[PDB]
Design a protein around this nucleic acid. Structure first.
Ligand code: SF4
Length: 85
DNA sequence: CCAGATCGTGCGACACACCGGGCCAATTGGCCGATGCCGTCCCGCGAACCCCTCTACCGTGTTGAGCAGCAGCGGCCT
């Protein structure tokens, strides 16, 4: 349908700062990614599943070692066990 | 002519609509409490850092043009 022939051939920016700009969650409620009280961690996991820079997000999160929120489709203890493994 | 598409109607299934129950998984996220390394500070000494002081064969010198005010002088006036 309205796919623009996979981004088409009309582009003038020819400039990218980094993989932040390709983040899908930026098009989405930030609050849902930090479940307070008990919360849930599956809808935002589904959102991350379709992210095109999931690997980069996971790598950056692990390298900087944030212990809050859900990054790369994984929550805190998945990151912790991956770090410990 | 007359037979399937369309639709009427019917029976069933049925994917949930409800609105209410009764428990549970995941997943907590706090810092609880205990343990440990770094920032700040107070000397301790020493290198340097800046200021002050003194040395007595003796030695004695660095263009043109325009406009205006002041000093010297010739010459009355008394
Ligand atoms: S993987 Fe990272 S960048 Fe992508 S949507 Fe999830 S949190 Fe955002």
């Amino acid at each position: 349908m309205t796919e623009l022939f996979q981004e088409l051939l009309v582009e003038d920016a020819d400039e990218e700062l980094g993989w932040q700009e390709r983040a899908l969650c930026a098009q989405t409620d930030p609050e849902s990614f930090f479940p307070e009280k008990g919360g849930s961690t599956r809808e935002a996991k589904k959102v991350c599943l379709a992210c095109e820079v999931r690997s980069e997000c996971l790598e950056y999160a692990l390298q900087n070692d944030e212990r809050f929120g859900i990054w790369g489709g994984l929550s805190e203890r998945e990151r912790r066990r991956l770090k410990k493994k």
